[PDB]
């Protein structure tokens, strides 16, 4: 790749028919209305920085007998929007993180009454030493985590 690792493509199912590509070189990748975000998505419903994706070095506790990935990288999806995003089947509350498995469909905004439906398809084109690329790290099948100063710090300098 020339600098692209993950591809988030606002599919036709969403009001947006565009394709976004997270330049592996940029970490973390910010998405939202304001062009300031590495990704450009303007939806009056979401905030200037509705959400951002961050890549981190994947590492387990121990390797007794079995030898896991040892120490590779995994892409994380962070959400900071008020409308809360939805990843596949997990809820994303303002200040949450989620693993992005190859072919991860993330819902940025969904309105039942407003019929406002959004969603991006994550397609890993390049694997920057990815432990795998994003299969769900076994056992833990798609679980939502909380964000900390580390994540908030990245957006703070947005």
């Amino acid at each position: 790749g020339n600098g692209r690792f993950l591809t988030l493509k606002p599919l036709p199912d969403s009001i947006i028919q565009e394709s976004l590509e997270i330049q592996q070189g940029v970490n973390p990748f910010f998405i939202g209305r304001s062009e300031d975000c590495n990704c450009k998505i303007e939806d009056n419903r979401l905030s200037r920085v509705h959400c951002f994706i961050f890549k981190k070095r994947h590492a387990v506790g121990k390797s007794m007998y079995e030898s896991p990935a040892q120490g590779l990288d995994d892409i994380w999806y962070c959400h900071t929007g008020t409308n809360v995003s939805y990843l596949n089947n997990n809820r994303m509350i303002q200040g949450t993180k989620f693993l992005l498995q190859d072919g991860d469909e993330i819902k940025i905004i969904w309105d039942k009454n407003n019929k406002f439906v959004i969603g991006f398809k994550v397609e890993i084109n390049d694997t920057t030493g990815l432990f795998n690329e994003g299969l769900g790290m076994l056992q833990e099948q798609r679980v939502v985590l909380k964000q900390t100063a580390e994540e908030k710090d990245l957006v703070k300098k947005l």
């Binding site: 009056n44 419903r45 979401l46 905030s47 929007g81 008020t82 409308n83 905004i109 309105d111 407003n114 406002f116």
Partner: peptide, 9 residues
């Protein structure tokens, strides 16, 4: 001229 987030219920 807009600059607010339409937070849904």
């Amino acid at each position: 001229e807009v600059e607010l987030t339409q937070e849904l219920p």
